[PDB]
UniProtKB/Swiss-Prot annotation:
Residue span, GH18 domain: 1-361
Glycan attachment positions: 39, 345
Homology family: Belongs to the glycosyl hydrolase 18 family.
SMART domains referenced in this protein's UniProt entry, alphabetically: Glyco_18
Organism of derivation: Capra hircus (Goat)
Cellular location(s): Secreted, Extracellular space; Cytoplasm; Cytoplasm, Perinuclear region; Endoplasmic reticulum
Protein name (Swiss-Prot/TrEMBL): Chitinase-3-like protein 1
Known function: Carbohydrate-binding lectin with a preference for chitin. Has no chitinase activity. May play a role in tissue remodeling and in the capacity of cells to respond to and cope with changes in their environment. Plays a role in T-helper cell type 2 (Th2) inflammatory response and IL-13-induced inflammation, regulating allergen sensitization, inflammatory cell apoptosis, dendritic cell accumulation and M2 macrophage differentiation. Facilitates invasion of pathogenic enteric bacteria into colonic mucosa and lymphoid organs.
Gene that encodes the chain: CHI3L1
Keywords recorded for this protein, A-Z: Antimicrobial, Apoptosis, Cytoplasm, Disulfide bond, Endoplasmic reticulum, Glycoprotein, Inflammatory response, Lectin, Secreted, Signal
Annotated binding of chitin, by residue: 49-50, 76-79, 120, 183-186, 241, 330
Oligomer and partners: Monomer.
Origin: domain of life: Eukaryota
Length: 361
């Protein structure tokens, strides 16, 4: 089993204990660590933060302690406009340029591969995403003739049916990618005025209306679409999604006024790190959807849908029974990396819970 963990660039700026550098990453925790978000500039891969070449270096020294570790650099991301990828992909001149620029960059900084995080290709992009992958992998084969090891190529793919039908030729791209991370955790959108969980494992009862918004469906769907099971990796989140209630209704379907208030460290409307959730639990009422097999909580007018040790071990067992390649954890820096926020004694409680199940057969 593979355990793919993303580390985010901007987490260094978090205040106090929230600050996180590659430094804190247990090198024996994951099989692949993905340094998150390289920019693309002048149609060539490039850094994003002023000190990336330093953190790049910091992350890859982890490999000196665990020579089995594999690292990748993700290009694209949530603050990299999708129209920008589009321009690059749909114009072969600029596409060959981006591709030719990649190997040297990775080799120079000690990475073992590239992760494409084109956040959502549209109807008019499908044919092009396929070319980018096909050609990018082709370039990777050639570059291995130099006697060095073949660089790995991966993609972070939407787990929403409409999104999947719209922009990906999964039968094609999966025959060329080394693995595919299914973004199975951003299901309840950014658009409802109703309370819901962003990562149910299963479908459930109250949900007679939005039927394919759970991990089980996404998986089954990728599978019948042509993706081999051993190239599929199911994303497990380490963050929670908050909501500010509009009535004293705490249960299923209650109305909301908007996203939840910002975490003291994470400073961002609608999102809380698991370590922020851990502090949030004291004084909160914890509930758990039996159907979807995921928990949520409430205090005053704050409703939080998150993942805990149990639900994460569950998603992990599922992944094993359907025989997937492994799990992906979004944000090593959103988990309790210091291990001094969540009561239990461990470092990275959530990610460790996944490793344990992956390792137990
Ligand atoms: C990611 O790459 C982006 C390039 O695709 C880049 O945005 C752009 O480049 C700079 C901003 O850094 C802006 O500025 C200009 O610099 C020249 C050099 O002196 C000036 O003579 C010109 O006035 C020019 O405008 C660009 O306007 C901007 N636009 C584009 C289309 O690239 C970002 O800087 C990169 N993002 C990060 C976070 O590093
Ligand atoms: O630089 C990109 C931004 O990434 C985050 O966004 C949420 C994302 O919108 C959601 O789809 C995903 O499931 O989780 C991440 C949590 O990391 C950051 O919260 C932003 O601060 C970043 O700017």
């Amino acid at each position: 089993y593979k355990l793919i963990c993303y580390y985010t660039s901007w987490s260094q700026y978090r205040e106090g204990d929230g600050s996180c550098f590659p430094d804190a990453i247990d090198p024996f925790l994951c099989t692949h660590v993905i340094y998150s978000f390289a920019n693309i500039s002048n149609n060539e891969i490039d850094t994003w933060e002023w000190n990336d070449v330093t953190l790049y270096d910091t992350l890859n020294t982890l490999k000196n302690r665990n020579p089995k570790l594999k690292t990748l650099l993700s290009v694209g991301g949530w603050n990299f406009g999708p129209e920008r990828f589009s321009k690059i992909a749909s114009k072969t001149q600029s596409r060959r340029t981006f591709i030719k620029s990649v190997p040297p960059f990775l080799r120079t900084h000690g990475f073992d591969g590239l992760d494409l995080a084109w956040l959502y290709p549209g109807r008019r992009d499908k044919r092009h995403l396929t070319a980018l992958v096909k050609e990018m992998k082709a370039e990777f084969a050639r570059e291995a003739q130099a006697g060095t090891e073949r660089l790995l190529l991966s993609a972070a793919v939407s787990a929403g049916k409409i999104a999947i039908d719209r922009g990906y030729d999964i039968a094609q791209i999966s025959r060329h990618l080394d693995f595919i991370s299914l973004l199975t955790y951003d299901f309840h959108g950014a658009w409802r005025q109703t309370v819901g969980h962003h990562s149910p494992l299963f479908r459930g009862n109250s949900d007679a209306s939005s039927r394919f918004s759970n991990a089980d469906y996404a998986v089954s769907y990728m599978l019948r679409l042509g993706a081999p099971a051993n190239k599929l990796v199911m994303g497990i989140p380490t963050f929670g999604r908050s909501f500010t209630l509009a009535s004293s209704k705490t249960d299923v379907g209650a109305p909301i006024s908007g996203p939840g208030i910002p975490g003291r460290f994470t400073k961002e409307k609608g999102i809380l790190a698991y370590y922020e959730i851990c502090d949030f639990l004291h004084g909160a009422t914890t509930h758990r959807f039996r159907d979807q097999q995921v928990p949520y909580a409430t205090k005053g007018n704050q409703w939080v849908a998150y993942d805990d040790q149990e639900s994460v071990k569950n998603k992990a067992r599922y992944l094993k029974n359907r025989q997937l390649a492994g799990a992906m954890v979004w944000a090593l820096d959103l988990d309790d990396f210091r291990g001094t926020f969540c009561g239990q004694n461990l470092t990275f409680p959530l990610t460790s819970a996944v490793k344990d199940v992956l390792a137990r057969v």
